[PDB]
Amino acid sequence: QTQFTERALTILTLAQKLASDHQHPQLQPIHILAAFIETPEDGSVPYLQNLIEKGRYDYDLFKKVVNRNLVRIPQQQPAPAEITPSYALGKVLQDAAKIQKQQKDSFIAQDHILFALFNDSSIQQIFKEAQVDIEAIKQQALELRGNTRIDSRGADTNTPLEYLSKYAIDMTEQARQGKLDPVIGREEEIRSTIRVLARRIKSNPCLIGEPGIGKTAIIEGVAQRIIDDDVPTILQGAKLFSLDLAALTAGAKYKGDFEERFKGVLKEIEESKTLIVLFIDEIHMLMGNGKDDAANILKPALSRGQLKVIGATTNNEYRSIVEKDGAFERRFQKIEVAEPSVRQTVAIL
């Protein structure tokens, strides 16, 4: 007694509606495929379009082939009120159920219907006529969700986050689960970091000091201050991600791979409806040492306003960046982070 997901039910609903508009006797796999290439109600990217476009195929050609093959189906003269499923479609629904149990999922989703679709010879010649490798789209569907199982009725989102999951860590959700420890003696420097983020000019703080001094403790303090809603109006409901440069580097063995991954992370941020503050440790390994390509990706994104960045570097390394990039100095506010022994002495003097 398995149940469908909300998006899977929408596909079967659109397929039932498309067969009714074309007045076709029975529901066929071509209808479900036509429901996949259908533009969603909210203008979001369809699930199948993302797989095909990221596979670097011509999606417009694919739509044109599916439509001309569906119009090729003759229209019955008197439209009945009973659109039964065909024998070919019955196997698809039965095949999607075993695909769900094969992957140990709790619900039948778009993926399972799409996988069971790939087995029908009707849609197999559709992909061949559209010159789209059907086995490459299958690989795209496998890599998409990763290894996260489908537990809820709405776990099969069309375009899940691919770059923010591989090369970033959500510090906010990690703070909700009590995986962080509040370090003492740094609330004054946390207050300054949040004050800069609420600003509209130079809204990107940059922590200055030697690594391992408590910089990571300040970021974890800002995250837990966003969770309990102790932040100004602008930061209410904002997620705090941490860019993993080691993950960006591992596997990038081709020229431009690092920039492509970094551009993909920023793209998922700028399209997010909620404001996202990205923390970049050792930011000099991005904006300095003659790395102009990475700088030309972050600087325009900061101007659009959707992204706020918390940088972290040493004093001499920050001065090295500013000495050859005035535009960087006008977007980042300097915040000095000293060792507790030095922080206590300065306050006494």
Numbering used by the authors: 4 to 352
Sentences from the paper on this structure:
Members of the ring-forming Hsp104 family are the principal protein disaggregases in fungi (Hsp104), plants (Hsp101), and eubacteria (ClpB), but are absent in animal cells. Hsp104 chaperones are multi-domain proteins consisting of an N domain, an M domain, and two AAA+ type nucleotide-binding domains, termed D1 and D2, which can be subdivided into a larger α/β domain (D1- and D2-large) and a smaller α-helical domain (D1- and D2-small). Hsp100 protein disaggregases are powerful molecular machines that harness the energy derived from ATP binding and hydrolysis to disaggregate a wide variety of aggregated proteins. We propose that the N domain plays an important role in protein disaggregation by facilitating both substrate binding and Hsp70 interaction to accommodate a variety of Hsp104 substrates.
To provide a molecular understanding of the functional role of the Hsp104 N domain, we solved the 2.8 Å resolution crystal structure of an N-terminal fragment of yeast Hsp104 (residues 1–360; Hsp104ND1) comprising the N domain and an extended D1-large domain featuring the first α helix of the D1-small domain, termed the C1 helix (residues 343–351)39. To solve the phase problem, we crystallized an engineered Hsp104ND1 construct featuring three methionine substitutions at Leu36, Phe118, and Leu248 (Hsp104MMM), and determined the crystal structure of this variant by seleno-methionine (SeMet) MAD phasing. The unbiased experimental map enables tracing of residues 4 to 352. No unaccounted electron density was observed that could be attributed to bound nucleotide, irrespective of the 5 mM nucleotide (ADP or ADPNP) that was added during crystallization, suggesting that Hsp104ND1 was crystallized in the nucleotide-free state and indicating that a complete AAA+ domain featuring both the D1-large and -small domains are needed for nucleotide binding. The N domain can be divided into two repeats related by a pseudo two-fold symmetry. However, unlike bacterial ClpA/B proteins, the N domain of Hsp104 features a four amino acid insertion that extends the length of an intervening loop region (residues 40–49) conferring asymmetry to the yeast N domain structure. Surprisingly, we find that the N domain of Hsp104ND1 interacts with the C1 helix of the neighboring D1-small domain. Binding interactions are hydrophobic in nature consistent with the notion that molecular chaperones bind misfolded and aggregation-prone protein conformers that expose hydrophobic residues on their surface. N domain segments involved in peptide binding include helix A1 (Leu12, Leu15, and Gln19), helix A5 (Gly93, Leu96, Gln97, and Ala100), and additional hydrophobic residues (Phe7 and Pro88). We show by structure-guided mutagenesis that the pseudo two-fold symmetrical N domain features a bipartite peptide-binding interface, involving the first helix of each N domain repeat (helix A1 and A5).
